[PDB]
Structures are given as C-alpha cells and as structure tokens.
C-alpha cells in the first residue's frame, strides 16, 4: 500500500494512499464542485498543469470507459480530449471495484497508463477551504525518495502546450465552414458544431486565420493565462478591426481572448469559478441559467467601447460573457458544451448558426428570447396535516410551518388549518406561528367555512400531504375557490390534476415525446392480456396484497394472473422495470421559468416490496454524466411542460445497461421524498416553494445556509446520505408483505460504508451495523434457503445479504436476486473483509492504520469490540489512546465553495479538521430517533418545546437526532444541530468534543433515556432526576420493593426461569396472566411455548387505566394531569384513547393516584418530567409502571391544561425558578369544567401476527389526533371527523365473539334504535334477530362465492350500506384470518373500525346525544 503526501506551499501536508502512477508531480492545486462525470472531467484540457481536488468524495464508481475508441468524426468517443490533462488527482475515497456497463477498467489502471499521480484518503474539503479565496495555491504530490520543488505552470503558455500542432478537419463535406481556434478545446464543442451542419477546421492557437475562407469563427479553450497567447490576441484584434462580419463565438478562453482583442483587461481570479452549479444571468433579458465552469481567469467588467456584457455571475458579480453592440461577435465564459454538467445552455450553439444563416450584421440579442409579473396576496389559507385517504394513507407533513414562515416574511397574513390541538405544527410562537389557526378537519365543508369566515385571496394546498391536496382540488372543482375569489398559489389545479391522474399525465407527456407505460387495473384474464398487449412485454402483475410477479410473454401472464384471480377480484398490470435503477429528482421552478435540480436519489434496494420504502442514497452513485444529465434534462422539460411553480418530485426507472429510461411518476405536492431532500442538502424546499408561490423568483430569494448566495443554484454535496425505512414490525424474521413504513432514518458519511453503517444502526438499537451475525445473538437455521431469503420480503434481509456474501455466493447472483447494483455489493463486501481482518487481531496486534480505516468505513467501537475480544468501553479507550477520533463538518450546500455560518452538522472519521469552534459549551437535547410504533410525533413536540425553553433563556443549544421527518431538526431553531446517531458512542463524541454544559435525556422517548446510566458513567452531566434513580425506578425488582415500603399497591408479579416455576405462580394468584421476553395467558399452553427469564404479572379484568403525567422538583409534584383510557386495561396500552379529565374514576381512586404519585416522586428524587400508569378498579389503585421521562401524552396534557409541562420540566432541570402558584400541583389541580379532551391515534390498522403460539390478529397505531368538546362524546365525534372519517349513519357490521353476546346485546339494540341497520355473520345475525334486533346475514370473506343469498362485506361496503365495522377480539382461531380481512377491508375502504367494546359503547352513546354543530366557533383551553 504505497503512500504519498499532498503538500501545499502554505505548509499544509496530508498523507494519502497512491492509486495513480507512483511518482511526484508539482502544480497548481484547484478544486471543482461538480459531482458527476470524472472521466469526462479529468480529460478537460483546462486542467493542464493542475492537481485536481475532487469535491465528490466517492471517485471511480464507473471505472474508465473505452479510452481508445473513436467516433466516425475521429474524436475520442467518450473523453473530452486525447488523454488525461490533470497533472495529478486528489480524492477522499477511491473505488477499487467498479460497476458500469460502459466500463472497461478501473480508474486506477487508467491513471497509471496515463502516467498521472493520484492519492486517495485525504480531506478534500479541508483542501477546498484552504484553496478558496487564495489566488494561486501551489502544491505537489510527493513520494518519499522523489522530491520536487514548487512550480507555477501558469507562468508558461499552456494554451500552446494543449493546442493541436497542425490543422484538423471534422465533419469533412458539410455545408458550413467553421474555423475553431484550439486553445484547449473540448471535444463536445466540436461534436455540437458538426451536428448542426458544420465542417470544423480546428486550427493551432497561433495559426493565421485572418484571411481564410469561413462562414463562422469559434475560439474555445481552457488552460492558462489568456495574456500569454499574445499572437492569438493580435489575430483576433485584426478580425475585429477589419470589415469581416463573419459570426464570432467565444467559449471560456474565447471570452478572455475576444475581450483582450477589443481592449479589455484580464485578471487571475482570487476565487475561481470551477463547478457544474455556477449561476449566470443574461443581463440583456434577465433570464437565469445554471452553467458548468472551469476558469481561474476573468475579464474585467470595465469593457471598451462597442462591447457590452452579456452574462454576469449571480454569486460573485464577475463577467460571464460579452457582446458586440452591432456585429455578430459574442462570448460566454462558461462551457455550454458541458460534458460534464447541465445541458441548459446548448441553445447558444443554435444561436451561432442562426447568426451565420442571417449574415447581415444582426446582433446576439436578436437570436434568443426577449424580456417579460407576480401575484398580489393579502391573506393565505394554508391547509395543514390532514387525515387519511383511500390510497396514500399515513403521512405527517408539518412543512406548512415553513410556509407560514415564508408568508410572514412578505407581510402576508396567514390562516392555518390543523385538526390536532396538540400538533407540533401549531406549537410555534414566532415567525412560524400562523396569525390565525383553526382546529378543524381538512374537508371541503370545513375549508369552505374557513374561507367564508376569513376571506383569504390565497390558498396553499400542496404542503399538507395527500388529504389536503384532494380537498383543495375538490374545492376548485365545485367552483368554491372561484366563488370567494381565492387563487391557488403555485402549481395550478389543472397542472396538479394532470399529475394526479395517470391517463391525463400519459397525454400531457406525449405532447413532448415522453412516454409513461400506462398501468392498468383489470378484473379478468383477457383484459390482463389486453393490457399486457398495449404495454408490451415484459410485464409486472401486482396483487392488492400477496413468485414476484413477472411475465415475459402471454403464456406466463395467463398462468400467473390465473393464480392471482383465484385469490382476488382486481390486479394491476404494469411495465416490468424491475432490476432497473430507480433514480429520483427534486426540482424547483419559479414563475419566471428558472428551473433547478436540488437533489438526486438512487434507490439502493426496494427490499422486495413496492410502497415507497426503499433504501436510498443521495447523491446518486452509479450513473455516468451522460445518464445523469439526460434524466435531469428530462425532469426540467416535464416540469416546464406541466407548468410547475414550486417543487416537483420525478421518479425514473433507468435500464441498467443502456440509456433507455421511463418516467414512473411525478408529485407536484410536498412529500416524503421532498423532506428527505431538504435535510440531505440543506436546501429548504417547503420554504422556497412558498416564496415561489407568491411569484418571487429564485435569484431574489436568499440561500439560508450560505448567507451570501441565492436559492437559484444546484447544491453540491461533499458527503453522501443514506436513508433506511423503519417498518412497523417488531421482530427479526425471514412471510407477510403488507408492512407499513412507519418511520425513517438518515445518516451522513463521506464514504458509502460510513453512511450505510450509521443508517443501519439508527434503524434499531440492536442493529450493530452490517454483518452476517443476526441480532439478539440468534443463530442461522440449518434448513436455510438462502436464495429465498434474498428474494422474498424480510426483516433480516440485510443480514441475509451479509451472509450470502460471507458464504461466497457470487455478487452477480446477489445482484440478480436482490436487484441491488453490484457497486453497492462491492462496498458491502469490503465491510465484511474488514471484520474478518479484525477478528484475527487484538488490543496489541491491531495497528493504528487498521483501526483508522475501520472507523472510516463505519465500524462502531462495539463492532470492533466483538472482534478483538474487548468490551465497548475498552475499545473506546484503545481508540482514544491512538488519537483516532471523528470530525465535525458542516453541511454548507456548496461543498465549501462559500463558507456557511449556520451550524448544520455531522460527524465523520474521513477528515483532518473540524469546521466549527467548541466554545458554546451548550445544553445537549437528545432527540427521539426514528418514529416507530410506541414512539410517534409527540416526542417532536417535546423537542421543539424544550429547545425553545432553552433558547428563550439565552442558553446555547446542541440538538442531536437522526429522524428526517422531525420539525425539531431545524438549524434555524437551535445553535448546533448534529444530524447524527443517538448511540452511546456518538453522543459521547459530540458531548465531549463540544464540552457541553449538560445533557437532557428526558424529552425524547425511550432511546435517550436508556442512555442515562452509560452516559452517566462516561462523564456526562445529565440534567434533572439522576440516572441512579432512573436505574432504580426501572429495575422491576427495586421499584416493586420501594412500592411495598411506601405501601403503594401493585399487581403481584414474579420473574420465572422454569415452566414449573411459571405454573406455580399462575396457580397462586388465579388465572389469567401476562408475559415478556406484551403477551396474554388464559390457559396452560401459551406459557408452554415461549422460552425454548420470563416475567409473570397477574391480569386484572374489568379494570380502568389511568395516566399520571407530571413534573417533579426536588421530589415534589409541581404539575400533574390525570387522564383516563377509554379502553379497559389490557395488553394494548400505548395506543389507548385518552380522556382528560377523568370520566368514570371514583374520587378516592384519584386521591390514591395522587398520593401514590407524591410518594414515588419523593422516593426517586425526581426533578424533571415523569409518567406513572395505574390500574383502577373501584377503589383499588395498582401501579402498573413508572417511566422517569416525558410520555407521549405530554403535549395533549399541556395544550388541554394551558401549561407547557415540557417547559416547566426544562426549567426545573436547568435550575431556573418556576412560580408554582398557577401550576397544577397535587393540592391545586387544573380540571377543565366546560370541555373534555380526547387523544386518539391518527391512523390504525390490522396486523396478522407472528410468533404463532396462537394466530393472533392485532391492531397497530401511530400519530395523534386530539380534540376538545363539551363532553367526551362530542370530542370523540370531532376526533372521528378529524381523522378524515364521515360520522356513521346507514349501517353497522357487527363482529363479536360468541361468548360476548350477553354483554353486547344492549349496545346492539341501542344502535338499532338510533336507526342503524345491523349486519353480522349468520350465527350472530340469527341470534340478534332471535332477540328481536333486526339484522341482515352476511358472509365471512373466506366463504365468498359459496352462498349467493348472503351479500359479501366488500359489496356492502362498496354499496355504502356498511359505514362502520365493529370487530371485537375473537379468540376463535378458525376465524382469525377472516377477522384480519374484515378489519383490513374497513381500513382500506376508509370507514371507521372499532375493536374495543368501551370505544364501541362511547360511540353508541355519542350518536344518541347528537357536523358544524360541534365546532361552531366555540372557545376552549384552560
């Protein structure tokens, strides 16, 4: 492994690993922020004599193309010149292994062949920061024993060096004779001239062309001081002073020469323009363009008489082109031929030929477009996060808050609609608080009523997810918007509808020679064959539910769809693009037609499912410049053609071994995709799109991160990002295919391997990284069908991939079975080989170089610890002994071209400096990690509040979180945001690097609070309630003993190790019982199959359950709120609907809850938030459990009581005083008298589960809806409306257990008496009818087809007969899959589903009692 130093003339050294030719070379060190097209880039004649620092950290993914191949024009087929032009190459990471269809060899092999030196392993960002604003930074790549001095190659005539020595002819025989003056021309200049009918005579830089016959002249170049080419400047002068009026087109060096030849001056830029994201402005008509540039010399803006500036630089105000006021002479300083770079300025070549074809001294202005208008708005309605749709059900989207922010800045009055009263969106108090907020459902009735009342003239319907969109679309289509005179701001509804309907899209896109491949939903075999026939084979059939799924010909489609129609009514026929590269683009377009790509994402792995899961990386890694720029160009034409004014998302499928692509879809509303893109790049889409909808153009909006630059640009990422979904599963397995993606993680690295391993760890705390060793120490089965495990969906898929590599299955086979591009599989194999290396080493034999490298590819100290036989603490010690630590970098949007001084931060081992100072010494606030079941959006409310409490008292903050769906991860609302792991390791690194004053672990759910003790032992000041007490409060055995000592009752329990131990307890307290590794037991057999140390709690039936949410100070309760669950106490608990204040709890029970709490608070010395759960039966109060942290009910409680508990808690924790007089202390509570509050989940759905001692249908739930009402019954009906449901009125499906009949009959009659028609299955229906309760028989979904007297439930729900299902736990194992299906039908149809008898009762009573009655602008909130 040979090594070398890059040394700079300022003293700086960095050691690196040679992958080039192993020899020294000296030169000018430059940087370039263009991410793509390194093979094209390093053949740019412009780099002659220059050592190129690549901004992109991952170089060599595509190998090298065929470097000997010529086109029929005799130019290099794939390069921009005859060979490599850089003197040397500096990169962070070099891909040894490569994967492109055009690749013929490694980039290392190509560089050695060309005699060019290249070192990897150096900090290209530190270099950039050093080179930036320093005129000419000289340096050398030096190998030991090969010294070389510093030399400036720019003091010799580099134009001469790269210029053709003799005249060459290209496109011999064409009609239009173009003399091209070679000052370092790029091949694409030649290629684009010839394509437009030119015969191109390429002449030496000092050739005498003043007398040649020609139709047009072109001067194109790259390297060197334009001043040293004096002979050429003279020859141009002589043209200009002659009467020749043949069109003259200068590119880059052309601009410099042409300018010098007319009497202008050139300077060496102290800050050069080298990038693919360089913004220019056409002075003459105020149009903006994104350009590739590569020059460190510029033309002074004091031009001489006759000449005017044409293009100017938007970032730095330097000259970017010039024009003759009369004659057809012009120049651009940028490269319109790009290659690499954006294909946005090619029209300048058309312009050129037009100036030949006119030939009457026409001007440059004459053959382009000409000058042009914005909406006046006084009050905008913003539809916020809504309910669920009959399709894309399950989205959070609190980006309206950024929209509100945008509006306020333009003095636009704002009205926000969000039905959740405890929403993080409406928990803002500054520029992001709306002027007026309505807590109403997002439906046409309610938005119409808000319109009548508020009389807005603006609407934003594209920043509240799908439900909001459909609502404002519908409102447009009833003329409601036109009637009250409300504009749609941004993309129009016509445009939006064309994106939302597939057929309409397929038409609009056919208007510009773009094709979709229409998907067809079909109910028969012959219509499947018809659809297939229209699409063209191969094709994909997808069932609604659930090999995958593919038909190359009509034979197969029939066989497969025939199977499919024997289990369902409808299938979807689509074009098969499976195994193609999925790439997406985020695009922005303003009302002045400026258009920019902000981010791009490559799906790594779809995980064997459909959805919008997808392991994703940004930027894309495996595309060539050609492939990237084609798709970009296509995005921009589609987006222009749709008239997008705002953000768009456009997903492509790209054939993996060709340039064939197709457009999968377009979303002209904000999405998951667009949120990821904002956090990945630093570019605030939602905020910018809001400004755009007022009609403000991008160059007039500020780049919030940079400060100095505009939002009219394309970000440049000097890191890579990885995003992994968090699924709703909770166990690690190898069958089911309708899992929902309930959350996601994002991780930032400067190698793929670092990013990827962090992403893995963020996903779930018991995922160590990428290994073949399964979590929980489980072992691989010996019946293991490894091909299967790689093709079917599973929750240990990544482990299986790891195993397949480790078991020497080829990567080609893995690529074929997973569809994961082999480039990703190479990097994954590199991780597994490091682990093998490590396993053979120990604390002594392991070298600094091996450890450094392991950390640089994402190994945790824990992973290393398992290999070396150390513990984690010992491994950390070992590492710090060697001074191996990570580095704090900024995301700055521009790859360090301009410095950011906002603090959006990440931590990487691939660096040599930090990018910030550590003088703040602020208060750390740990975030919650990815949303999952149990842990939803409420802990984001808690974050915003705690952070705010610290901000408002002037305390410097440090925020840490890795959930990209969180409002709290906003660099504008804390001082330092680290977008980072919430592991012990990474939090120790940040806490100690910063020297944080303390750390708050209380306000982020379970992840940060489990770190209490480990943090405590590793030197962290944990604010509030001591981690020693947290350990005590959450050791069952210790907490139970404290409770006997305090004389506070609890249900008896016992940890057991044996079956006879278990059975003897259950006996001793009567059945039934509970379980853990929460599971139920009624009889001896469940117990029998689980451990093959289990905790056994006595179950109390018919019990109420109570949350006590509180704040302690020095052990005294200083705020509290008691809330009652609707549902009887049971295993379901963290998805219980809550009622505040209590409804059916004896007064003595309350006093006992209060007293128990006072005691618990004192026993554990609580100073901070905390929660306690209780069983209450009559007057018996039993404590269930105590969590020494904020609960999910904290926002609810706070917004109900008019007191921010998290704010009270934060103050207590930092020692700020808090006046107790108006807080809800135990002696003076706050009980609402005129209103009740309900907290319910936003979305709920069935899961078929899983361990299978019994097949069990469960409900799962996420999100929050919370409402006030006069009493609980109206609040519950408002909740129902607020989750997007219609209040039931026609009919009710009744599914109950046979044994539950006596207890249900009352409710059933009650429901029939309110005018509901009852449906049930035949046994139930009969029995209801038998008791004089009318009911219609229906059929179990299994038995559909076998009894035509009985209507199917799907028909009665399509009908509209059934608009509420009641489906209570049915332990009968025969009908479990049926009850799963009934539930599933209800949820996907969008009719309300009730699964608990108390919720059922609460509904029945509610309809008896009783949609614009219940809200009717009535007032609340104390």
Ligand X SMILES: COc1ccc(C(=O)N2C[C@@H](C)N(C(=O)c3ccc(OC)cc3F)[C@H](C)C2)c(F)c1
CB of 255 to Zn ion, least distance (A): 9
Cβ nearer to Zn ion, comparing 312 with 496: 312
**Among residue numbers 270 through 299, which ones bind Zn ion (CB under 5 A)?**
273, 293
What pairing do the DSSP bridges indicate for beta strands 1265-1269 and 1236-1240?
Answer: antiparallel
Cβ-proximal residues to 733 (8 Å cutoff; 6+ apart), any chain: 794, 795, 796, 1250
Residue matched to tokens 């219980």: 1136
Taking CB under 6 A as the binding criterion, the range among 432-440, 719-727, 1213-1221, 1261-1269 that sits at the site for ligand X is: 719-727
Interface pick for ligand X out of 52, 90, 724, 1292 (rule CB under 6 A): 724
Q: What is the DSSP string of 1097-1151?
A: EBP-TT-EEEEEEEEEETTEEEEEEEEEESSPSSS--TT--EEES-SS--HHHHH
Q: Do 89 and 118 touch, CB atoms closer than 8 A? A: yes
Interface pick for ligand X out of 392, 795, 1018, 1040 (rule CB under 6 A): 795
Long-range contacts of 518-526 (CB under 8 A, 24+ apart): 519/572, 519/573, 519/574, 519/575, 520/572, 520/573, 520/574, 521/570, 521/571, 521/572, 521/573, 522/570, 522/571, 522/572, 522/573, 523/569, 523/570, 524/565, 525/558, 525/561, 525/562, 525/565
Query: Measured between alpha carbons, how far is 697 from 285 in angstroms, rounded to an integer?
Result: 14
CB of 224 to Zn ion, least distance (A): 16
Asked if the bond preceding 1412 is cis, omega within 30° of 0, the reply is no
Which partner in ligand X, Zn ion, none is near 416 (CB below 5 to 8 A by kind)?
none
The distance from CA 439 to its chain's CA centroid, rounded to whole angstroms, is: 28
CA distances from 1167 to 1116, 1119, 1187 (A): 8, 11, 13
Phi/psi of residue 1015, nearest 5 degrees: -60, -50
Taking CB under 6 A as the binding criterion, the range among 547-555, 728-736, 1126-1134, 1190-1198 that sits at the site for ligand X is: 728-736
CB of 333 to Zn ion, least distance (A): 5
Helix 625-642 / helix 502-510 crossing angle, nearest 10 deg? 110
CB of 500 to Zn ion, least distance (A): 41
Query: Measured between alpha carbons, how far is 1158 from 608 in angstroms, rounded to an integer?
Result: 52
C-alpha torsion 590→591→593→599, nearest 10: 10
Under the criterion CB under 6 A, does residue 729 sit at the interface with ligand X? yes
C-alpha torsion 1211→1214→1217→1220, nearest 10: 40
Cβ nearer to ligand X, comparing 107 with 742: 742
Under the criterion CB under 6 A, does residue 763 sit at the interface with ligand X? yes
Cβ nearer to Zn ion, comparing 268 with 1401: 268
Which partner in ligand X, Zn ion, none is near 664 (CB below 5 to 8 A by kind)?
none
Which partner in ligand X, Zn ion, none is near 1031 (CB below 5 to 8 A by kind)?
none
Dig out the tokens for 1141 from the structure.
């204040």
CB of 759 to ligand X, least distance (A): 7
Q: Which residues pair with 747 in a beta bridge?
A: 722
Interface pick for ligand X out of 178, 288, 498, 760 (rule CB under 6 A): 760
Residue 32, marked binder: no
CB of 730 to ligand X, least distance (A): 5
Taking CB under 5 A as the binding criterion, the range among 327-335, 812-820, 1163-1171, 1364-1372 that sits at the site for Zn ion is: 327-335
Interface pick for ligand X out of 451, 615, 817, 1103 (rule CB under 6 A): 615
Three-class SS state of 1261: strand
CB of 607 to ligand X, least distance (A): 5
CB of 1010 to ligand X, least distance (A): 15
CB of 273 to Zn ion, least distance (A): 3
Interface pick for ligand X out of 605, 940, 981, 989 (rule CB under 6 A): 605
Cβ-proximal residues to 1033 (8 Å cutoff; 6+ apart), any chain: 1039, 1160, 1164, 1186, 1188
Under the criterion CB under 6 A, does residue 764 sit at the interface with ligand X? yes
Dig out the tokens for 1263 from the structure.
């999100």
Interface pick for ligand X out of 217, 587, 717, 798 (rule CB under 6 A): 798
Dig out the tokens for 759 from the structure.
């992403």
After which residues does the chain have a break in its backbone, defined as C to next N over 2.5 Å? 372, 546, 734, 1077, 1092, 1410
Query: Measured between alpha carbons, how far is 256 from 1210 in angstroms, rounded to an integer?
Result: 61
Taking CB under 5 A as the binding criterion, the range among 8-16, 46-54, 268-276, 686-694 that sits at the site for Zn ion is: 268-276
Cβ-proximal residues to 188 (8 Å cutoff; 6+ apart), any chain: 80, 337, 338, 339
Under the criterion CB under 6 A, does residue 604 sit at the interface with ligand X? yes
Residue 1324, marked binder: yes
Residue 33, marked binder: no
Q: Do 179 and 203 touch, CB atoms closer than 8 A? A: yes
Residue 1340, marked binder: yes
CB of 713 to Zn ion, least distance (A): 14
CB of 1212 to Zn ion, least distance (A): 56
Which partner in ligand X, Zn ion, none is near 17 (CB below 5 to 8 A by kind)?
none
Query: Measured between alpha carbons, how far is 1223 from 1217 in angstroms, rounded to an integer?
Result: 13
Q: Do 419 and 445 touch, CB atoms closer than 8 A? A: no
Q: Do 1264 and 1241 touch, CB atoms closer than 8 A? A: yes
Q: Do 657 and 101 touch, CB atoms closer than 8 A? A: yes
Which partner in ligand X, Zn ion, none is near 763 (CB below 5 to 8 A by kind)?
ligand X
Cβ nearer to ligand X, comparing 595 with 820: 820
CB of 961 to ligand X, least distance (A): 18
CA distances from 118 to 39, 53, 90, 1216 (A): 14, 10, 6, 57
Residue 908, marked binder: no
Site map (CB under 6 A) of ligand X, residues 766-785, x = contact = -x------------------
Cβ nearer to ligand X, comparing 795 with 1133: 795
Interface pick for ligand X out of 619, 725, 769, 1004 (rule CB under 6 A): 725
Query: Measured between alpha carbons, how far is 957 from 959 in angstroms, rounded to an integer?
Result: 6
Interface pick for ligand X out of 191, 327, 581, 797 (rule CB under 6 A): 797
Which partner in ligand X, Zn ion, none is near 1021 (CB below 5 to 8 A by kind)?
none
CB of 1369 to ligand X, least distance (A): 24
Count of residues interacting with ligand X (CB under 6 A): 19
Going by C-alpha positions, the residue among 276, 901, 903, 337 that lies closest to residue 600 is: 276
- Three-state DSSP string of 184-199: CCCHHHHHHHHHCCEE
Taking CB under 6 A as the binding criterion, the range among 8-16, 759-767, 806-814, 948-956 that sits at the site for ligand X is: 759-767
Site map (CB under 5 A) of Zn ion, residues 328-357, x = contact = -----x------------------------
Cβ nearer to ligand X, comparing 363 with 603: 603
CB of 134 to ligand X, least distance (A): 41
Asked if the bond preceding 1141 is cis, omega within 30° of 0, the reply is yes
Which partner in ligand X, Zn ion, none is near 469 (CB below 5 to 8 A by kind)?
none
Q: What is the DSSP secondary structure assignment for residue 303, as one 8-state letter?
A: P
Taking CB under 6 A as the binding criterion, the range among 37-45, 727-735, 1284-1292, 1351-1359 that sits at the site for ligand X is: 727-735
Which partner in Zn ion, ligand X, none is near 273 (CB below 5 to 8 A by kind)?
Zn ion
Cβ-proximal residues to 430 (8 Å cutoff; 6+ apart), any chain: none
Interface pick for ligand X out of 719, 727, 898, 1174 (rule CB under 6 A): 727
Under the criterion CB under 6 A, does residue 607 sit at the interface with ligand X? yes
Going by C-alpha positions, the residue among 586, 587, 581 that lies closest to residue 602 is: 581
Under the criterion CB under 6 A, does residue 730 sit at the interface with ligand X? yes
Q: Which residues bind Zn ion (CB under 5 A)?
A: 273, 293, 333
Q: Which residues bind ligand X (CB under 6 A)?
A: 604-605, 607, 615, 724-727, 729-732, 760, 763-764, 767, 795, 797-798
Enumerate the known binding-site residues.
1321, 1324, 1340, 1367, 1370, 1379
Enumerate the known binding-site residues for N-acetyl-L-glutamate.
1321, 1324, 1340, 1367, 1370, 1379
């Amino acid at each position: 492994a040979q090594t070398a130093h890059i040394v700079l003339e300022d003293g700086t050294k960095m050691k690196g690993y040679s992958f080039g030719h192993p020899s020294s070379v000296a030169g000018e060190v430059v940087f370039n922020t263009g991410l793509g097209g390194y093979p094209e880039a390093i053949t740019d004649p412009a780099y002659k004599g220059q050592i190129l620092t690549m901004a992109n950290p991952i170089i060599g993914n595509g190998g090298a193309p065929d470097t000997t191949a010529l086109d029929e024009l005799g130019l290099s087929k794939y390069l921009e010149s005859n060979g490599i032009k850089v003197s040397g190459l500096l990169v962070l990471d070099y891909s040894k292994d490569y994967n492109h269809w055009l690749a013929t060899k490694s980039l290392g092999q190509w560089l050695q062949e060309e005699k060019v030196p290249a070192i990897y392993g150096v900090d290209t960002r530190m270099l950039t920061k050093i080179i930036r604003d320093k005129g000419t930074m000289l340096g050398k790549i030096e190998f030991e024993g090969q010294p070389v001095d510093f030399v400036d190659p720019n003091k010799q005539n580099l134009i001469a060096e790269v210029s053709t020595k003799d005249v060459k002819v290209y496109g011999k025989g064409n009609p239009t004779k173009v003399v091209a003056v070679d000052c370092g021309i790029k091949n694409n200049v030649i290629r684009l001239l010839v394509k437009r009918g030119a015969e191109v005579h390429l002449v030496p830089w000092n050739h005498d062309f003043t007398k040649m016959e020609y139709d047009g002249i072109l001067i194109a170049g790259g390297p060197g001081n334009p001043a040293l080419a004096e002979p050429l400047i003279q020859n141009v002068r002589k043209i200009l002073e002659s009467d020749r009026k043949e069109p003259l087109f200068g590119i880059s060096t052309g601009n410099l020469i042409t300018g010098l030849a007319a009497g202008a001056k050139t300077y060496k830029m102290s800050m050069a323009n080298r990038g693919q994201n360089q913004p220019v402005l056409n002075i003459t008509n105020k149009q903006a363009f994104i350009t590739a540039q590569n020059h460190g010399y510029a033309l002074d803006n004091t031009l001489p008489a006759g000449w005017k500036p044409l293009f100017v630089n938007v970032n730095d105000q330097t000259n970017e082109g010039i024009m003759h006021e009369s004659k057809p002479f012009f120049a651009v300083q940028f490269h319109p031929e790009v290659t690499p770079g954006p294909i946005d300025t090619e029209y300048l070549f058309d312009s050129f030929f037009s100036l030949i074809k006119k030939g009457k001294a026409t001007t440059i202005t004459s053959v382009l477009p000409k000058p042009a208008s914005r909406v006046e708005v006084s009050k905008v309605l913003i539809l916020g996060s809504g309910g669920l749709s009959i399709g894309q059900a399950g989205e959070f989207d609190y980006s309206g808050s950024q929209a509100v922010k945008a509006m306020k800045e333009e003095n636009v009055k704002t009205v926000l609609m969000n039905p959740n009263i405890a929403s993080v969106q409406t928990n803002e108090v500054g520029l992001k608080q709306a002027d007026t907020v309505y807590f109403l459902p997002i439906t046409p009735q309610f938005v119409t009523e808000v319109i009548k009342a508020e009389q807005p003239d603006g609407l934003i319907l594209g920043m509240g997810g799908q439900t909001a969109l459909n609502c404002g679309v519908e409102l447009f289509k009833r003329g409601v918007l036109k009637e009250y005179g409300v504009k749609v701001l941004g993309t129009s509804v016509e445009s939006i509808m064309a994106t939302e309907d597939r057929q309409l899209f397929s038409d609009k896109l056919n208007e510009i020679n773009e094709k979709i491949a229409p998907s067809f939903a079909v109910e028969s075999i012959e219509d499947a064959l018809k659809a297939a026939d229209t699409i063209g084979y191969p094709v994909m059939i997808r069932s609604a539910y659930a090999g995958s799924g593919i038909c190359p010909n009509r034979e197969t489609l029939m066989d497969l769809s025939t199977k499919a129609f024997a289990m369902t009514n409808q299938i979807l026929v689509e074009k098969s693009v499976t195994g193609w590269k999925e790439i997406e683009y985020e695009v922005v377009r303003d009302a002045d037609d400026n258009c920019v790509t902000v981010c791009n994402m490559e799906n790594v792995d779809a995980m064997g499912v459909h959805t919008g899961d997808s392991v994703v990386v940004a930027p894309a890694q495996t595309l060539s410049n050609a492939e990237f720029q084609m798709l970009r160009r296509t995005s921009i034409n589609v987006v222009r053609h749709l008239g997008i004014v705002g953000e768009c998302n456009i997903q492509f499928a790209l054939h993996p071994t060709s340039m064939e692509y197709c457009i999968i879809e377009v979303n002209a509303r904000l999405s998951r995709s667009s949120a990821l893109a904002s956090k990945a790049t630093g570019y605030p889409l939602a905020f910018i799109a809001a400004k755009i909808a007022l009609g403000i153009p991008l160059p007039e909006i500020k780049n919030v991160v940079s400060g100095k630059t505009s939002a009219c640009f394309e970000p440049s990422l000097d890191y890579m990002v990885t995003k992994i979904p968090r699924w709703d599963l909770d166990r690690f397995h190898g069958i089911g295919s309708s899992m929902k993606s309930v959350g996601e993680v994002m991780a930032i690295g400067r190698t793929f391997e670092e990013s990827f391993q962090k992403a893995l760890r963020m996903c779930h705390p018991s995922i160590e990284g990428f290994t073949p060793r399964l979590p929980m120490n489980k072992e691989w089965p010996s019946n293991l069908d490894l091909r299967k495990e790689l093709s079917e969906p599973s929750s240990t898929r990544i482990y299986a991939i790891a195993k397949a590599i480790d078991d020497n299955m080829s990567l080609d086979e893995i690529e074929k079975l997973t569809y994961i591009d082999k480039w990703f599989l190479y990097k994954m194999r590199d991780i597994l080989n490091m682990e093998k290396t490590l396993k053979g080493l120990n604390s002594e034999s392991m070298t600094e170089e091996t450890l450094k490298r392991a950390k640089e590819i994402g190994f945790s100290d824990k992973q290393i610890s398992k290999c070396l036989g150390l513990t984690e603490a010992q491994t950390r010690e070992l590492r710090l002994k060697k001074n191996i630590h990570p580095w704090v970098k900024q995301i700055d949007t521009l790859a360090a071209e301009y410095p950011s001084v906002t603090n959006y931060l990440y931590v990487t081992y691939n660096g040599q400096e930090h990018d910030v100072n550590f003088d703040d010494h602020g208060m750390m606030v740990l975030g919650c990690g990815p949303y999952h079941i149990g842990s939803s959006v409420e802990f984001d409310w808690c974050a915003v509040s705690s952070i705010r409490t610290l901000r408002q008292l002037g305390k410097k903050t440090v925020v840490v979180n890795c959930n990209p769906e969180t409002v709290s991860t906003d660099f504008d609302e804390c001082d330092k945001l680290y977008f980072e792991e919430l592991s012990l390791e990474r939090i120790l690194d940040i806490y100690h690097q910063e020297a944080c004053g303390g750390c708050i672990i209380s306000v982020g759910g379970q992840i940060p609070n489990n770190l209490a003790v480990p943090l405590y032992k590793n030197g962290v000041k944990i604010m509030g309630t001591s981690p020693l007490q947290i350990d005590r409060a959450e050791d069952r055995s210790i907490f139970s003993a404290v409770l006997d000592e305090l004389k506070v009752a609890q249900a008896p329990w016992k940890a057991v190790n044996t079956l006879n131990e278990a059975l003897e307890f259950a006996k001793s307290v009567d059945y039934p019982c509970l379980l853990r590794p929460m599971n139920v037991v009624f009889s001896e057999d469940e117990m029998k199959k689980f451990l093959e140390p289990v905790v056994l709690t006595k179950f109390v039936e018919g019990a109420r359950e109570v949350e006590m949410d509180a704040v302690g100070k020095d052990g005294r309760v200083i705020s509290h709120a008691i809330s009652e669950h609707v549902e009887d106490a049971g295993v379901h608990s963290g998805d219980a609907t809550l009622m505040l204040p209590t409804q059916t709890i004896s007064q003595g029970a309350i006093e006992k809850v209060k007293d128990a709490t006072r005691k618990i608070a004192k026993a554990f010395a609580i100073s901070g938030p905390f929660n306690v759960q209780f069983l209450v039966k009559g007057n018996d109060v039993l404590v269930i459990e105590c969590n020494l942290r904020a609960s999910r009910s904290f926002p609810f409680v706070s917004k109900t009581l008019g007191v921010d508990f998290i704010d009270v808690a934060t103050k207590v924790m930092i020692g700020e005083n808090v006046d107790e007089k108006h807080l809800p202390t135990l002696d003076h509570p706050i009980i609402p008298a005129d209103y009740v509050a309900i907290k319910a989940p936003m979305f709920s759905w069935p899961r078929l589960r899983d361990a299978d001692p019994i097949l069990r249908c469960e409900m799962a739930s996420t999100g929050e809806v919370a409402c006030f009402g006069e009493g609980i019954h109206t609040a519950f009906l408002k909740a129902m409306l607020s989750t997007g449901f219609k209040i039931p009125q026609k009919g009710i499906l009744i599914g109950i257990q046979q044994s539950f009949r006596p207890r249900f009959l009352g409710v059933a009659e009650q429901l029939h008496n309110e005018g509901f028609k009852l449906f049930a299955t035949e046994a139930t229906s009969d029995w209801l009818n038998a008791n004089n309760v009318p009911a219609t028989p229906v059929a179990w979904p299994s038995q559909e087809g076998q009894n035509p007297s009985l209507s199917s439930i799907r028909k009665l729900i399509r009908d509209g007969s059934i608009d509420l299902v009641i489906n209570l736990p049915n332990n009968n194992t025969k009908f479990v899959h049926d009850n799963y299906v009934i539930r599933r039908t209800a949820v996907d149809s969008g009719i309300p589903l009730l699964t608990n008898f108390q919720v059922t009762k609460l509904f029945a009573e509610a309809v008896q009692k009783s949609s614009k009655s219940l809200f009717h602008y009535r007032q609340y909130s104390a």
